[PDB]
Enzyme design. Structure first.
Site, PDB file in Angstrom:
ATOM      1  N   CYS A  40      -3.758  -5.546   0.617  1.00  0.00           N
ATOM      2  CA  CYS A  40      -2.595  -4.709   0.882  1.00  0.00           C
ATOM      3  C   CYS A  40      -3.030  -3.299   1.262  1.00  0.00           C
ATOM      4  O   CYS A  40      -3.575  -2.556   0.443  1.00  0.00           O
ATOM      5  CB  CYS A  40      -1.647  -4.710  -0.335  1.00  0.00           C
ATOM      6  SG  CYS A  40      -0.527  -3.294  -0.467  1.00  0.00           S
ATOM      7  N   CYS A  99      -1.478  -0.273  -0.635  1.00  0.00           N
ATOM      8  CA  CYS A  99      -2.043  -0.306  -1.984  1.00  0.00           C
ATOM      9  C   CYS A  99      -3.374   0.453  -2.052  1.00  0.00           C
ATOM     10  O   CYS A  99      -3.592   1.285  -2.937  1.00  0.00           O
ATOM     11  CB  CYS A  99      -2.267  -1.755  -2.422  1.00  0.00           C
ATOM     12  SG  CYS A  99      -0.769  -2.755  -2.480  1.00  0.00           S
TER      13      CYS A  99
END
Lengths: 105, 105
Positions: free
Chosen positions: A32, A35
């Protein structure tokens, strides 16, 4: 530093260890992008705020925890205190995250 | 039918086999509630629309593919044709999915 929750039993141990402190839990995945971008900011927050505990859960590693917490977007920040869910934030919005920390800590 | 992509090579193979057809890819996780909520509708649509190729990618099985496509919120529907990206939809909105299929078929 941000502690990585290992399993469900570990999650309870960490929530207990946090005492009365607000706990911020980052549900993330290694694939991600957002993230990874926000992770260093969480580490800095973790380093500086002594009245807040920061945790992280790798959803690919703890799929049970991700399911139990109805995660759909990465990252999701869960806000807990004394074992109670106070708030949730979907996405890498650092300002809203900081606001929820200041509001709940 | 909604075919489950096994890995990066299998993804490429499926994209080639589609020829000129619209390809819709569902990036999902087995711990994802809205993913499971919409999966049967995608299966129903795929059985009817033989001029569209429907695929699915379990982000836990194919983390590399997940990272390649910048997946954040799930389910994510990626719309492709001839190996190229046309559109993307985050979340389980069935009407928007039908609009985007109608737009790109």
């Amino acid at each position: 530093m941000v502690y990585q929750v290992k399993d469900q039993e570990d999650f309870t141990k960490q929530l207990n260890e946090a005492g009365n402190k607000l706990v911020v839990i980052d549900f993330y995945a290694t694939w991600c992008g957002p993230c990874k971008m926000i992770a260093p900011k969480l580490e800095e927050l973790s380093q500086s705020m002594s009245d807040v505990v920061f945790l992280k859960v790798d959803v690919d590693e703890c799929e049970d925890i991700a399911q139990d917490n109805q995660i759909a977007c990465m990252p999701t920040f869960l806000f807990m205190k004394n074992g109670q869910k106070l708030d949730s934030l979907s996405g890498a919005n650092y300002d809203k995250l900081l606001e929820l920390v200041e509001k709940n800590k």
